[PDB]
Design a protein around this nucleic acid. Structure first.
Ligand code: K
Ligand code: K
Ligand code: MG
Ligand code: MG
Ligand code: MG
Ligand code: MG
Length: 114
RNA sequence: GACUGGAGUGCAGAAGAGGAGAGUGGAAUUCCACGUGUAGCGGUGAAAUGCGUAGAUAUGUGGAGGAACACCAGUGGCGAAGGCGACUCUCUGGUCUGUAACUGACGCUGAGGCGCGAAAGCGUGGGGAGCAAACAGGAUUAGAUACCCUGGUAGUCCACGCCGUAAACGAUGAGUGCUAAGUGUUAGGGGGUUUCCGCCCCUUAGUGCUGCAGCUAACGCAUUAAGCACUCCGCCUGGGGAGUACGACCGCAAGGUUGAAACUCAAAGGAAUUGACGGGGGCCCGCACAAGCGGUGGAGCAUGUGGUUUAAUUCGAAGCAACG
């Protein structure tokens, strides 16, 4: 009711933004597809902003003033999404990383055009 | 017979992902269960196949399973090479530095043999999370038995045993000595100075950069020589056929090692130079685009050209650069 955590999964294809409680129960989420986009336009900072805003202004169901934000992936829309979450009318307390880095564990798939 | 600069042992130190075994750690991919949780996720140049209201995607908790080990990590270390990176222990190999104690040429190479030997692959039995040949579906395309997407078996991992190939490459055989420098870097030693620290110089074995002589067809090599010399081995004698055929040996097999001729060609090739080109880069320009104006292509006619039909339909011009 007072504070939440935001998880953004930004990738070179789409941006998901989920607002949850600090001990990890979902209240809301959104993405560019639920926002109404269909192609590469999903992958844009504008879609990132819009999905962020929809997420936060539904998170004001049970209400909050403060967010801790956690950013995942190489998607370029993290700046726009964080600006959205600051400017929607919430006090983003801190930003942090969820870069899922293995210490050379399981290997990636192949490069493209090979 | 004698000696020690080679070679080796001893003695005092130093580094190290050198190898085998056993055990061990946490990231992190996947999966199982459970909450929260609502309609998308994924992917592309666009998509679609596919997963998803029988509830995902995500988010947290806990658990299972295997594979590889970020930072350190560096033209840095070690190793004969292949290659070796998480940690600890055990068992082991080799290298360098200093000494001049010890032996006293005991050495260098090395046909034929013996072993090792990336990855793929083969046999048996496990394991199999990811990635993934083959394959299926979806796109692409003129077609696509491909690139591209979603899935995915062999495999990849282990034990044991085979296979013994490689752009297995520094495309540069092992050994010895000699022939200018400058500079990093690693492991050591010696000395001058200084409170150690720190700076400096000399030297040993490595590893890299740049360069003198000299060599080289040149590119370039240059005390880590492709220099100057000696020993030993292996290999070459135009291209292709052909690393084929016969033969032998090895191999469960796949296939490997050894290795020709007939026939055919008049070249094949290396390095470098000048251009031209480039679905390479960079800089600059032109109505070249873009921004705009008005037009052609549509209609009718004039003209020219083509094709044709003609006794003849004179000849010439033919992408830009022929066709009022
Ligand atoms: K096997
Ligand atoms: K190699
Ligand atoms: Mg193998
Ligand atoms: Mg224009
Ligand atoms: Mg007209
Ligand atoms: Mg004419």
């Amino acid at each position: 009711i007072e504070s939440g955590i935001a998880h953004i999964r930004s990738t070179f294809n789409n941006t998901i933004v989920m607002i949850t409680d600090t001990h990890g129960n979902a209240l809301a989420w959104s993405s560019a597809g639920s926002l109404g986009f269909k192609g590469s336009r999903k992958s844009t900072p504008f879609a990132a902003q819009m999905a962020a805003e929809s997420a936060a202004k539904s998170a004001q169901e049970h209400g909050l003033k403060t967010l801790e934000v956690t950013v995942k992936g190489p998607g370029s829309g993290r700046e726009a999404a964080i600006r959205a979450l600051q400017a929607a009318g919430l006090e983003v307390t801190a930003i942090k990383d969820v870069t899922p880095v293995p210490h050379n564990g399981c290997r990636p798939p192949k490069r493209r055009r090979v």
